[PDB]
Structures are given as structure tokens and as C-alpha cells.
């Protein structure tokens, strides 16, 4: 029946009924299935394909859930779900109401940690190891960490604590030489005679061994697992193993775009997108500005920096999954007269809060942040919704914050930010925007925002994604004015004083948490101006958001067009119900 | 006239004057500097032992290189007193950390000789890489040298940095200042370990370990190392407190020693009962009847008041080094396993773990409790240490609760709740003291309920923790003015806030936090969504880093102290005696 072995496994107990010599076949069955799961659309094919054999060996040897198997990032864990009672739900992975794309504690007893951000497996594994010992229990603790994740400060510091404590712990290093856009770093410790790249951490080191030989992998685990103290099993795997398209092109196949398993041919997006626009703009800027230096923390592809990396190799830098290192390395360059631009997703910028505050903001350094995936990002769910931005940057003295309405306005903010003292942050969503001509570089007074639709009475203030919704909401409402509130640090105070002084009510809309964001900046402003209009604050509630499309999350959170219209109606505006 | 005992320093106004000395005279400068720092520090709360410890390499560094052209970077900066004495600031060591004076750590706008502004650890390597890359980009050849101590190296931000530094392969000298002390004894793996190179796996040259107090022999090395291609780790071994017998004998206390006389080594015993202690006492007592409690600290056992606890409960204490990120996510891991970990951390260093708190602890609403010391303005340490953002950045995290205990009984109350209810909880408290309290004090409180502390609607002041002291004083002989212990920032006391904003002429909020996105901001959001529009005055620390002064000073000029609230009260039309 194409999957004879898998058909009889509903969990790891069913798995432990197969002989070792049956496991390679199960291994093929699992690859078949993972390919079918993903041929759907945007999911993690290659990382999971590469990890099948180790996940099989682990679940064969250890008995979860008494034993705890911890996954770093969790994107490489599809076989794990398939072997733990979730085979049917893979159909809806990352879909609203379905299971999560990563391991989630809520979801299953077998999911040890809720992960999505990288490099948290080892600190968590240590936490469990310590808790175990205090309790007087004993049960295995295995962490699966990829070579890319090993690059993070968090992984590297953790080992050093792990080695000090010297507890019973299995750490499997899943080594691909691939991150997304292929690993960097004086390879973290692998890539070194041949002995122990970790000796200085006082951790036992085994391998490298062949990470696709499931039988050899069982044998090893069985012997490694009752050893005293911490161990690194270093396994070498091929990203996208068992699909020649994925194998040959490990970067595209990390997140393929709907394909036919039989051919290797995929649906090509010809979309534009903020990422590409930022791409074009910096690639163009650095052509005339020798001081511009782009740094990404492991996200060349995700941020539209491929052409940038090819057109200015001498002004590009990939610091690995090390956001802390991105930000303060930019801080260094800025101190030496450069104009560094840190390209970073909103959730990942969270990892560098202190680096922004202490290393950049104190001395008002010249670092421009271009922040991608700002607001809800959708399918990745709680771990990735870049929904805190406008709160946490806002609190930091001297850090400027703007939201471009479009590519032209992005460019302007970029030009400006690159051309004036201090840090500037510019946030934009996952989503598309229109291409503008080469050499489009408008001047804008930073902090000034613009009227877009006439109307006092009720005035909507929003920027970026929220501004679409605002402009859609007001389409046929003559009373209702809209303002492109495109700066959040500086608010446009002259404008807000004037609008808040002579309007019945105001609405603020933000693709950000409601708490301490744009809504709050306005309230604080109005309060210092001793002004008291009716204000309705729409954004994401103070609570995390499961995976869902950005459009439902917004619909349910009350910031999409229909919702703004409902709020407008509560306010007294005549809103049609429409044919 | 020249009646000094420091003939060499008397003639050195910067690195250019120092290179006039022969290399044989260096040991003599080495010793003048030593005496100079002991005299400077006998004042009070300064960084004696670390600075003495690094006297010899700082001398050798300025002798070999030449700032400003070459770039000498210092990690943390608490060890760089010699650097300040050798760079035209010898005379203002008298006022270091004082308002209006030079800063305790390296500071960029303070001297062209200060390559980075520092206060938080582990940031040196990464700025050094940045400077190196820019220099290279610009087509220049000046030296970049960083000084990092061994505790500092414990930090993920240095460890990752080495990883990127080894990858780029650029001219750079990194001196490892290894005295196997942090503030406490340094914590290990890497400390345990130290004809093989410990950094082999990161493509960085390794020289040493070498004697770090031989100034003669450190110049020799530097002269040969500094023109090599690629990055170099120079490993030196020093003695924290070198030069001062009793500092050597006890490098934990002499790290930041009280007023002392150099001749004996006798110091003023600071017999205050601080918050740190009130914490320590409370956790020690609590862990005794609760085996699920586990206290984690990121290198701050002594500062967080955990010395006794680490001795009484060795099996429920953990010191993860200068790595806040690990402190928090180790705690997540613990709580995931039915334990009840307590992360003891200064507000300012909690910033290093914002993402860990959010993603590793908040997403699954985990049983981690944060006792946050140094909440608010810490004073003399200035901008890099004032913990004035925490009410803002925690508030934004779904499910993270925040209390400010009026006092030590209330600390115990909050600690009791957090430890016996689900989800995360953060308790923040100042530098300073409260009255001791009897053993077994464990009040029951309802999390999120404020207490009224003074009668009178009309103007109501809302303050918690340290602001509360000011609020209460301000209000003294003013019968219209009521004070609420707003002992909870998240959640707020919804009902009592609606009651008070519904009835009072005006409200004042006060907070030892930035004014942006904090308690005030939270109050304003609540009133908004309750559709209540009273006059509110929001008092706090302005959206502006605060240079070194005394808390009293910073609070004076920010307008959160008593006379300042009294002024606000007059402005709202309260009758306030002149
Ligand atoms: C803190 C953080 N920054 C960036 C990312 C983006 N990211 C998601 S998966 C991935 C690659 C992880 O590399 P590796 O551990 O080698 O995974 P593998 O391709 O080997 O399966 C990255 C960089 C992330 N998940 N977390
Ligand atoms: C993020 C952070 N956490 C904690 C501190 C507190 N701290 C200041 S100095 C120091 C010890 C520094 O150790 P090391 O580099 O070995 O310097 P040494 O005392 O040996 O001179 C610590 C932990 C800090 N500066 N930054
Ligand atoms: Mg990999
Ligand atoms: Mg040291």
C-alpha cells in the first residue's frame, strides 16, 4: 500500500516493533510522505528530509515522552510529527486550526519545547537535565541542533554552561553545512589531527558520523545514551536528502513554492514584495555611497539581499544566526565613519533589544535598521509574528521609527536615514508593493506625516499595512479623513495637536500589539497636549496569535477594512450595509 | 614644585609622553599607576581590583600602539582606570562617577581615546570586528585591539563574535585578560579548561598563556604580534587586585570596595539592610519548604544578594556566567519540567534577555519568576546601567506579570504568589534598603489589586515601589491628595482605576521608569478603553539617557521626587504651602 510499515505506526511504541533492519524502508516511506506533504506549497521540505534518519534512530532508541527529544527551530521535524500520532494532520500543517509547522508543547506530549527562533534547544535541554537531577529522576535528554543554529550566542554560551555542570545529556549536531543561505562562521566548531573541536567546553565528542545510516545511528545512540556527562554526537547529513532537486539546490528547497514531486518543477512567484524593493534600493544606494554596509543575521534570501551580495561583495556581511552580532558589529562600523544598514526581520530583532539600546542608542550611532516581516506574518504563528517593534523600539531614546506607505516612501526613509545622525528604524510587512523607477529618491521631512483623504469629524491615523485597511475602510465615507501616520518616533505633533483638537473622534490602527505601540504613543501625546478626543485603538490584542493567514488574524483582531467600518459605525458615521 | 612620589606620571599627559620613557622605566610607571589607583579608590564605590589587575597590559598597550590613530577597545570598562590616567584624565579621577565628572567606564564622547561606550559586558569583540571591517573597507591600516576579561568571554555575544572574527580573518588583536575571576569566581567549562589552542575551532591564532604583569615582556610580545595577518588571541594571566595585598587575598569584595584606608586595608562595614538582602533572605526561607524552587543568576550572586542562598541550598542554585540569555531559557527548561525557577537579575541586564522572556517563557506561559534588582535609576553607573525601561519592555509581552513591592513584607507576598500560580511573573525593586522583617512573614495578596494608602479623591497620585516613597511624602499635609500603592503594572487594577478616574479632579502617575510606554502609558491606555477622560499628569524619567549622578539628583531633575510632585500638585490647583 505504498507505506506498509508507516500504516501500522501511531506512535513510538509501534515504531519499536520493527527490527533495525526494517528501518531503512521506514526511512524511505517517511521521505515519500514528507515530499507529498510539502508539494502543497510553502513549507520546510529540505531541512526535514535531511533529518529523517536521526529522528527515526532517536525515537527507536529513547522512549518519548518519558524521555525528552528537543528540536532546535523545529522546522526539521516533520518525521517526528509523522511518528507521533500526527500523520493525518500533516495535510493541514501551518493552516488555520491545524497543527503548527514547529514542535509545540500545547500540541503533543512528544513536543518537548515550543521553538521557532533558533538556538534555544541547548539551554532548554540543560534546564530539563538540571530539573531531572533535582527531582532524583533519570530519563534521557536529547537535543537536535543544526549547524546553523550552533552559530548563535545562545547555543555557544549554553555548551559552556553544559560542560561546567557536566550532566547526562545527548546533543546531536545535525550538520548540513547549510543554514538557509548556507552556513558561515569559521564553522562554529565543526571544521576543526582531527580530535574534539569542543574540548574547551569539557563535553564528550563523537563523530563526525554518517547521518543517513539509520542502523549505524541506532547502534551509536544505544551506546552513547547511558554514558555519564554531556555528549555531542556530530552527524553529517545532506540537506534535502532523497530528493535530487532538494539535494542539488538546498537554498530554494528549504521553503519550496508548490511543486510536482515527479518532475522537480515548481510554481514560480513573479510577485514583487517589500523584500525586493529594499533589495533594489540598497543595491542602488551603495552604488553611490561607499560608506553603506549591509549586515544580515543569516537571512540573505529572506531580505532580498541576493543581488546585493553579488553586486557589492565587499560591503555585505552574514553573521550567522547571531542577531546580537549583527547589531553591535554595525555599531562598530558606524563608530568608524561607515553607514551600516542592519537588515533584520522584526521577530529576530527582538534578540538584539539590548544591542540596540546599549551599543547603538546610547551614543546615537549611525545605524539604519530595515525591518522586514513587521506585524503579523501569518503561517509561522506565535514565534514569528513581528508584532512588538513599535513598542520595544519606541521606548529606546533617540531611535527613530517609520512605516513607508509604498516603495517610493521606503526609498525616502532610506535616503533620509542614511543621511542624518542617529539610529533610524523602518518597518515593512511580508507582502507585496509596486515597483518604482530606478533612481526614485524623494525627500521627506522625517516625522511629518501626510493627509491622504480629506475629512475632519472622524480621522484615521495608520501607517504601512494598517494604512491599506484605513484607505479601504474610508472608500465611500465623506465624513471620514485618513492620515498616513508614517512615523512613530517623532509622532507628527503639530499635526496630531491640530487633528486631535478638532475632530469628534480618532482611530489609530497598527499592525502591532495594542500595548505600548502606536495607539499608546498617540494617547501619551494627546495627554501631554492636554487634549481629550474619543480615540479607538485597534491593533493586535495583548495575546499571542496562532498560525493563520495574516488576513484572518487581522479580521479577528479588528484592524481589517470591515472592522474599521464597524468601529466607525459605533462612532456615529453613516456606514452602508451595501447590496 | 615637584614634591610628588610619582615623577613619571607627573610628565605624562597622554600616550605620546609615555613613549618618551625607555622600556626599562615601564615597571616604575607600572607601580606609580598602582599607587595612583589605590589613592583614587579609597574614596568609596569604585572599581579598584579589576583596574589594578589590568595596569600592566594597559601600559604595554599604550606604549606599543597609539590611540587615537589605533583603536584600543575595553570590554565592560571597569578595568580601565590606568587607561584614563594615561589619557589626560589623571586629575579627574577624583570625581569619576560623580555628577558633572568623568564616567566610571570608557565613554566615546568623553575622550577620543575611548573607542567604545561600555557598561554591559561582552560587547568589545563585536565592535572590534566592526571597526576592523570598516577600516579594511576604507582602505586603512590602523590597529584594532580589544581587551576582554575571562568572565566577559562567557558571553554568547563574545563567543559568537569570535566565530565571525575567525571567519573574516582580518588584522585584529584580542587580549584575553584571564584572572579566573568574574565578580564572583568565574564559572566554567572554559574556566575549567584554562601546547594546544582552545580556540582552534574558530580559526584564531593563540598566544600564551603569558604572565600579564610583566610590562617589559608584554611590550616585547605586542611589538611582534600586532603586525601579523589575521586575528590573534593573546592570553594573559593576571591577579585581580594585583599590587594591593588584601585585594589579592579577597578579589570578590575588592571588586567595588567601600571607603577604605590603603595602609591597613580596613574599610567601613556597610551595615544597611538592602532590598538585595531582603530578597536573599526571602528566597532562602522559601526554598526550604519548597523543593521545586531553583535560583538562577547570570554572574551576580553577590549583587543579587544570593551568597547565603548559594551556601544553604547548593543544589538549587545556578550561576550561568555573564550570559543572561542562558539564565532565562535554562529557567524555561526547568519550569517545563515541573520545577519553579527564580531568575535573579538586574533590570538593565534583563534587557539582554528580552527575546528569551518573550519567546521561550511567554509563548507557553511558563512558571518562571523574575526577581529584578536595580530596577530604576541606579545612579553612579550612569546611562548603561539605569534600569529604567523594564516596565515598558515587559508590559508588551503577553502574560508577563509585573509587581513593585512597597516593602519587604510585600516582596514576600509577591514572591509567594508568583511561585504558587501559573505563568511568568516579574517583581522589580530598587537599589536601596527597606526594614528587615520577621522570619515567616508570608502575606497573602490578590495579584493585581492595588491598596489605597492615603485618603482623598481630588488629586490622586498613583505610584509604586520607589515612586511610592515620593508620592507618600509629597502628600503629607494635603488632605485632598490621596495616594494609591499602584503595586501592580500588569495587570493594572482595572476596577480601582475606573473608580478613581471617575471621581478625582485629576490624577498623577509616578514611576522609576522611562515615561514612554510605562506605567503612565499603561494607565492612559486603560482610561482610554474605559472611555474615561480625566486630567492625568504622567511623571517619569524623560526619553533621554541619564548620565551619572545620584538617584536623588536624577529624580530631582526628572521631576519624580517629593518637591517635584508637590510642584505638580500646585499646578493642578491644590493648595500647597510655599
Ligand atoms: C533567532 C532566529 N534567527 C533566524 C532564524 C531564521 N531561520 C529559520 S531556519 C534557519 C536555518 C537553521 O540552520 P540549521 O540549524 O543548519 O537548519 P537545517 O537547514 O540544517 O535544517 C534560519 C536561519 C530563526 N529561526 N531564528
Ligand atoms: C550583561 C552584563 N551582565 C552583568 C554585568 C556585571 N559585571 C560587571 S563586571 C563583571 C565581571 C567581569 O568579569 P571579567 O571580564 O573576568 O573582568 P575582571 O573582574 O576579571 O577584571 C560583571 C559580571 C555586566 N557588566 N553586563
Ligand atoms: Mg544545517
Ligand atoms: Mg577576569
Curated annotation (Swiss-Prot), chain B:
SMART domains (UniProt xref): Transket_pyr (SM00861)
UniProt entry tagged with the keyword NADP: no
Protein's GO biological process: 1-deoxy-D-xylulose 5-phosphate biosynthetic process; isopentenyl diphosphate biosynthetic process, methylerythritol 4-phosphate pathway; terpenoid biosynthetic process; thiamine biosynthetic process
Enzyme class of the recorded protein, top EC level: transferase
EC number, UniProt record: 2.2.1.7
Gene Ontology MF terms: 1-deoxy-D-xylulose-5-phosphate synthase activity; magnesium ion binding; thiamine pyrophosphate binding
Function of the molecule: Catalyzes the acyloin condensation reaction between C atoms 2 and 3 of pyruvate and glyceraldehyde 3-phosphate to yield 1-deoxy-D-xylulose-5-phosphate (DXP).
Binding site for thiamine diphosphate: 78, 119-121, 151-152, 179, 324
NCBIfam families per the UniProt record, alphabetical: dxs, PRK05444.2-2
Entry's cofactor comment: Binds 1 Mg(2+) ion per subunit. Binds 1 thiamine pyrophosphate per subunit.
Keyword annotations of the record: Isoprene biosynthesis, Magnesium, Metal-binding, Thiamine biosynthesis, Thiamine pyrophosphate, Transferase
Matching Pfam families: DXP_synthase_N (PF13292), Transket_pyr (PF02779), Transketolase_C (PF02780)
Source species, domain of life: Bacteria
Reaction(s) catalysed (UniProt annotation): D-glyceraldehyde 3-phosphate + pyruvate + H(+) = 1-deoxy-D-xylulose 5-phosphate + CO2
Subunit-structure text: Homodimer.
A single cellular component GO annotation: cytosol
Gene giving rise to this polypeptide: dxs
Residues reported in the UniProt entry to bind Mg(2+): 150, 179
Family: Belongs to the transketolase family. DXPS subfamily.
Cofactor(s) listed: Mg(2+); thiamine diphosphate
Pathway(s) served: Metabolic intermediate biosynthesis; 1-deoxy-D-xylulose 5-phosphate biosynthesis; 1-deoxy-D-xylulose 5-phosphate from D-glyceraldehyde 3-phosphate and pyruvate: step 1/1
InterPro entries listed in its UniProt record: Dxylulose-5-P_synthase (IPR005477), THDP-binding (IPR029061), Transketo_C/PFOR_II (IPR009014), Transketolase-like_Pyr-bd (IPR005475), Transketolase_BS (IPR020826), Transketolase_C (IPR033248)
Protein's name according to its UniProt entry: 1-deoxy-D-xylulose-5-phosphate synthase
Amino acid at each position: 500500500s505504498d507505506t506498509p510499515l508507516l500504516d501500522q505506526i501511531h506512535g513510538p511504541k509501534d515504531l519499536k516493533r520493527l527490527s533495525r533492519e526494517q528501518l531503512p524502508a521506514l526511512t524511505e516511506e517517511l521521505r515519500g510522505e514528507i515530499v507529498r506533504v510539502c508539494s502543497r506549497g510553502g513549507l520546510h521540505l529540505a531541512s526535514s528530509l535531511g533529518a529523517v534518519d536521526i529522528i527515526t534512530a532517536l525515537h527507536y532508541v529513547l522512549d518519548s515522552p518519558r524521555d525528552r527529544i528537543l528540536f532546535d527551530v523545529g522546522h526539521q521535524a516533520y518525521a517526528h510529527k509523522i511518528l507521533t500520532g500526527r500523520r493525518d494532520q500533516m495535510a493541514d500543517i501551518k493552516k488555520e486550526g491545524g497543527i503548527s509547522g514547529f514542535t509545540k508543547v500545547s500540541e503533543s506530549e512528544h513536543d518537548a519545547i515550543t521553538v521557532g527562533h533558533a538556538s534555544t534547544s541547548l539551554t532548554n535541554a540543560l534546564g530539563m537535565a538540571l530539573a531531572r537531577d533535582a527531582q532524583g529522576k533519570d530519563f534521557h535528554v536529547a537535543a537536535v541542533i543544526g549547524d546553523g543554529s550552533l552559530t548563535g550566542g545562545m547555543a555557544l554560551a549554553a555548551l559552556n554552561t553544559i560542560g561546567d555542570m557536566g550532566r547526562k545529556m545527548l546533543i546531536v549536531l545535525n550538520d548540513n553545512e547549510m543554514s538557509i543561505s548556507e552556513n558561515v562562521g569559521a564553522m562554529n566548531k565543526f571544521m576543526r589531527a582531527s580530535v574534539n573541536p569542543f574540548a574547551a567546553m569539557g563535553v564528550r565528542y563523537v563523530g563526525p558520523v554518517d547521518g543517513h545510516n539509520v542502523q549505524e545511528l541506532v547502534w551509536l545512540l544505544e551506546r552513547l545514551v547511558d554514558l555519564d556527562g554531556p555528549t555531542i554526537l556530530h552527524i553529517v547529513t545532506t540537506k534535502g536528502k532523497g530528493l535530487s532537486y532538494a539535494e542539488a539546490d538546498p537554498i530554494y528547497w528549504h521553503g519550496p513554492a508548490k511543486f510536482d514531486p515527479a518532475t522537480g518543477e515548481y510554481v514560480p512567484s513573479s510577485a514583487y514584495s517589500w523584500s525586493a524593493a529594499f533589495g533594489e534600493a540598497v543595491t542602488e544606494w551603495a552604488k553611490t555611497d561607499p560608506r553603506t554596509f549591509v549586515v544580515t543575521p543569516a537571512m540573505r534570501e529572506g531580505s532580498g539581499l541576493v543581488e546585493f551580495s553579488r553586486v557589492h561583495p565587499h560591503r555585505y556581511l552574514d553573521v550567522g544566526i547571531a542577531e546580537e552580532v549583527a547589531v553591535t558589529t554595525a555599531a562598530g562600523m558606524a563608530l568608524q565613519g561607515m553607514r551600516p544598514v542592519v537588515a533584520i526581520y522584526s521577530t529576530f530583532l527582538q534578540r538584539a533589544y539590548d544591542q540596540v539600546l546599549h551599543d547603538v542608542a546610547i551614543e546615537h550611532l549611525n545605524v539604519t535598521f530595515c525591518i522586514d516581516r513587521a506585524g503579523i506574518v501569518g503561517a509561522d504563528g506565535a514565534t514569528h509574528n513581528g508584532v512588538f517593534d513599535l513598542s520595544f523600539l519606541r521606548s529606546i531614546p533617540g531611535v527613530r521609527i517609520g512605516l513607508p506607505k509604498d516603495a517610493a516612501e521606503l526609498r525616502g526613509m532610506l535616503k533620509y536615514a542614511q543621511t542624518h545622525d542617529g539610529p533610524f528604524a523602518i518597518r515593512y510587512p511580508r507582502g507585496n508593493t509596486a515597483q518604482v523607477p530606478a533612481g526614485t529618491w524623494p525627500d521627506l521631512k522625517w516625522g511629518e506625516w501626510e493627509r491622504l483623504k480629506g475629512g475632519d469629524d472622524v480621522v484615521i491615523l495608520a501607517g504601512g499595512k494598517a494604512l491599506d485597511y484605513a484607505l479601504k475602510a474610508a472608500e465611500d465615507l465623506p465624513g471620514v479623513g485618513v492620515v498616513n501616520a508614517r512615523f512613530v518616533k517623532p509622532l507628527d505633533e503639530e499635526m496630531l495637536r491640530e487633528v486631535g483638537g478638532r475632530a469628534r473622534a480618532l482611530i489609530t490602527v497598527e499592525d502591532n500589539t495594542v500595548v505600548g505601540g502606536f495607539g499608546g504613543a498617540v494617547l501619551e501625546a494627546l495627554n501631554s497636549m492636554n487634549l481629550h478626543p474619543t480615540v479607538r485603538v485597534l491593533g493586535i490584542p495583548d495575546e499571542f496569535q496562532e498560525h493563520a493567514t495574516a488576513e484572518s488574524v487581522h479580521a479577528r483582531a479588528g484592524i481589517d477594512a470591515p472592522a474599521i467600518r464597524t468601529v466607525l459605525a459605533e462612532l456615529g458615521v453613516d456606514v452602508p450595509i451595501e447590496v
